[PDB]
Symmetry: C3
Subunit: 64 residues, 3 copies
Protein backbone atom coordinates (compact mmCIF):
# COMPACT_ATOMS: atom_id res chain seq x y z
CA UNK A 1 0.00 0.00 0.00
CA UNK A 2 1.46 3.38 1.05
CA UNK A 3 4.13 1.91 3.30
CA UNK A 4 6.67 4.31 1.77
CA UNK A 5 4.58 7.28 2.90
CA UNK A 6 4.06 6.00 6.45
CA UNK A 7 7.76 5.18 6.79
CA UNK A 8 8.60 8.71 5.65
CA UNK A 9 6.36 10.53 8.17
CA UNK A 10 8.20 8.81 11.04
CA UNK A 11 11.63 9.65 9.63
CA UNK A 12 10.70 13.29 9.09
CA UNK A 13 9.19 13.67 12.56
CA UNK A 14 12.21 12.21 14.38
CA UNK A 15 14.57 14.33 12.29
CA UNK A 16 12.53 17.47 13.02
CA UNK A 17 12.80 16.75 16.74
CA UNK A 18 16.58 16.44 16.40
CA UNK A 19 16.65 19.62 14.34
CA UNK A 20 14.70 21.60 16.97
CA UNK A 21 17.12 20.45 19.69
CA UNK A 22 20.27 21.28 17.73
CA UNK A 23 18.80 24.60 16.67
CA UNK A 24 18.16 25.71 20.27
CA UNK A 25 21.81 25.18 21.21
CA UNK A 26 23.41 26.12 17.87
CA UNK A 27 25.36 29.10 19.21
CA UNK A 28 27.25 27.25 21.96
CA UNK A 29 30.66 26.11 20.78
CA UNK A 30 31.08 23.58 19.29
CA UNK A 31 27.40 22.61 18.92
CA UNK A 32 27.22 25.00 15.95
CA UNK A 33 29.50 22.57 14.13
CA UNK A 34 27.06 19.73 14.82
CA UNK A 35 24.09 21.87 13.74
CA UNK A 36 25.71 22.50 10.36
CA UNK A 37 26.83 18.85 10.16
CA UNK A 38 23.27 17.63 10.81
CA UNK A 39 21.90 20.02 8.17
CA UNK A 40 24.48 18.85 5.63
CA UNK A 41 23.55 15.22 6.37
CA UNK A 42 19.82 16.01 5.93
CA UNK A 43 20.46 17.67 2.56
CA UNK A 44 22.35 14.62 1.27
CA UNK A 45 19.93 11.98 2.66
CA UNK A 46 16.54 13.58 2.02
CA UNK A 47 14.92 14.91 -1.10
CA UNK A 48 14.35 18.64 -1.36
CA UNK A 49 10.63 18.44 -0.58
CA UNK A 50 11.26 16.14 2.43
CA UNK A 51 13.87 18.59 3.81
CA UNK A 52 11.27 21.35 3.58
CA UNK A 53 8.81 19.09 5.42
CA UNK A 54 11.36 18.48 8.19
CA UNK A 55 11.93 22.24 8.48
CA UNK A 56 8.18 22.91 8.64
CA UNK A 57 7.62 20.28 11.33
CA UNK A 58 10.53 21.80 13.27
CA UNK A 59 8.96 25.29 13.20
CA UNK A 60 5.65 23.76 14.33
CA UNK A 61 7.44 22.23 17.34
CA UNK A 62 9.36 25.46 18.01
CA UNK A 63 6.20 27.59 18.29
CA UNK A 64 4.61 25.11 20.75
CA UNK B 1 -3.99 1.01 10.90
CA UNK B 2 -0.19 1.15 10.86
CA UNK B 3 0.69 4.61 12.23
CA UNK B 4 0.96 2.56 15.43
CA UNK B 5 4.04 0.76 14.08
CA UNK B 6 5.25 4.02 12.51
CA UNK B 7 5.21 5.38 16.06
CA UNK B 8 7.37 2.53 17.38
CA UNK B 9 10.12 3.42 14.91
CA UNK B 10 9.99 7.00 16.18
CA UNK B 11 10.11 6.24 19.89
CA UNK B 12 12.91 3.70 19.50
CA UNK B 13 15.12 6.09 17.52
CA UNK B 14 14.38 8.87 20.01
CA UNK B 15 15.19 6.47 22.86
CA UNK B 16 18.61 5.69 21.32
CA UNK B 17 19.44 9.38 20.98
CA UNK B 18 18.25 9.95 24.56
CA UNK B 19 20.57 7.19 25.79
CA UNK B 20 23.56 8.72 23.99
CA UNK B 21 22.78 12.18 25.35
CA UNK B 22 22.35 10.89 28.93
CA UNK B 23 25.79 9.25 29.04
CA UNK B 24 27.64 12.49 28.10
CA UNK B 25 25.36 15.09 29.70
CA UNK B 26 28.21 15.85 32.14
CA UNK B 27 30.53 17.07 29.35
CA UNK B 28 29.64 20.68 28.66
CA UNK B 29 28.13 22.03 26.53
CA UNK B 30 26.51 18.64 25.79
CA UNK B 31 24.27 19.13 28.82
CA UNK B 32 22.70 21.95 26.81
CA UNK B 33 21.91 19.59 23.92
CA UNK B 34 20.62 17.00 26.42
CA UNK B 35 18.19 19.56 27.84
CA UNK B 36 17.33 20.92 24.37
CA UNK B 37 16.47 17.38 23.29
CA UNK B 38 14.30 16.72 26.36
CA UNK B 39 12.67 20.09 25.68
CA UNK B 40 12.05 19.13 22.03
CA UNK B 41 10.74 15.70 23.11
CA UNK B 42 8.27 17.26 25.54
CA UNK B 43 7.02 19.69 22.90
CA UNK B 44 6.66 17.20 20.06
CA UNK B 45 5.21 14.13 21.80
CA UNK B 46 2.36 13.43 24.19
CA UNK B 47 3.18 12.34 27.72
CA UNK B 48 2.40 8.72 26.85
CA UNK B 49 4.89 8.94 24.00
CA UNK B 50 7.56 10.54 26.23
CA UNK B 51 7.27 7.77 28.80
CA UNK B 52 7.59 5.11 26.07
CA UNK B 53 10.89 6.62 24.88
CA UNK B 54 11.99 6.65 28.52
CA UNK B 55 11.16 3.01 29.20
CA UNK B 56 12.69 1.96 25.89
CA UNK B 57 15.78 3.95 26.85
CA UNK B 58 15.86 2.04 30.15
CA UNK B 59 15.59 -1.32 28.38
CA UNK B 60 18.50 -0.27 26.18
CA UNK B 61 20.56 0.99 29.11
CA UNK B 62 20.05 -2.40 30.83
CA UNK B 63 21.73 -4.24 27.94
CA UNK C 1 2.31 -7.83 8.01
CA UNK C 2 5.94 -8.57 7.22
CA UNK C 3 5.80 -5.42 5.08
CA UNK C 4 5.38 -3.35 8.24
CA UNK C 5 8.37 -4.99 9.96
CA UNK C 6 10.68 -4.10 7.08
CA UNK C 7 8.95 -0.71 7.17
CA UNK C 8 9.62 0.16 10.82
CA UNK C 9 13.15 -1.24 10.68
CA UNK C 10 13.92 0.75 7.53
CA UNK C 11 12.67 4.06 8.95
CA UNK C 12 14.65 3.43 12.13
CA UNK C 13 17.93 2.62 10.44
CA UNK C 14 18.11 5.46 7.90
CA UNK C 15 17.36 8.03 10.61
CA UNK C 16 20.15 6.57 12.73
CA UNK C 17 22.49 6.68 9.71
CA UNK C 18 21.73 10.37 9.23
CA UNK C 19 22.52 11.16 12.87
CA UNK C 20 25.61 8.96 12.65
CA UNK C 21 26.90 10.86 9.61
CA UNK C 22 26.24 14.20 11.31
CA UNK C 23 28.14 13.16 14.44
CA UNK C 24 30.99 11.46 12.60
CA UNK C 25 31.94 14.48 10.53
CA UNK C 26 32.39 16.71 13.62
CA UNK C 27 33.77 14.08 15.99
CA UNK C 28 37.23 15.63 16.31
CA UNK C 29 35.88 18.68 18.21
CA UNK C 30 35.54 18.03 21.90
CA UNK C 31 33.30 16.84 23.44
CA UNK C 32 31.47 16.09 20.19
CA UNK C 33 34.00 13.25 20.13
CA UNK C 34 32.38 11.96 23.32
CA UNK C 35 28.83 12.25 21.99
CA UNK C 36 29.99 10.40 18.89
CA UNK C 37 31.49 7.53 20.94
CA UNK C 38 28.36 7.52 23.09
CA UNK C 39 26.01 7.31 20.10
CA UNK C 40 28.12 4.38 18.87
CA UNK C 41 27.79 2.69 22.26
CA UNK C 42 24.02 3.29 22.32
CA UNK C 43 23.67 1.78 18.83
CA UNK C 44 25.65 -1.24 20.06
CA UNK C 45 23.23 -1.86 22.91
CA UNK C 46 19.95 -1.07 21.15
CA UNK C 47 20.73 -2.60 17.73
CA UNK C 48 21.50 -6.14 16.66
CA UNK C 49 24.65 -6.73 14.66
CA UNK C 50 22.73 -6.91 11.36
CA UNK C 51 20.87 -3.70 12.22
CA UNK C 52 24.19 -1.99 13.03
CA UNK C 53 25.71 -3.31 9.79
CA UNK C 54 22.76 -1.84 7.87
CA UNK C 55 23.06 1.52 9.66
CA UNK C 56 26.73 1.74 8.66
CA UNK C 57 26.00 0.97 5.01
CA UNK C 58 23.35 3.69 4.85
CA UNK C 59 25.87 5.97 6.58
CA UNK C 60 28.58 5.25 3.99
CA UNK C 61 25.97 5.71 1.27
CA UNK C 62 25.13 9.20 2.56
CA UNK C 63 28.77 10.17 3.06
CA UNK C 64 29.57 9.18 -0.54
CA UNK C 65 27.62 12.09 -2.10
Amino acid sequence: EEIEEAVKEAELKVLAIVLVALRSVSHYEPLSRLYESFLDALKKALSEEELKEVEKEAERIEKK
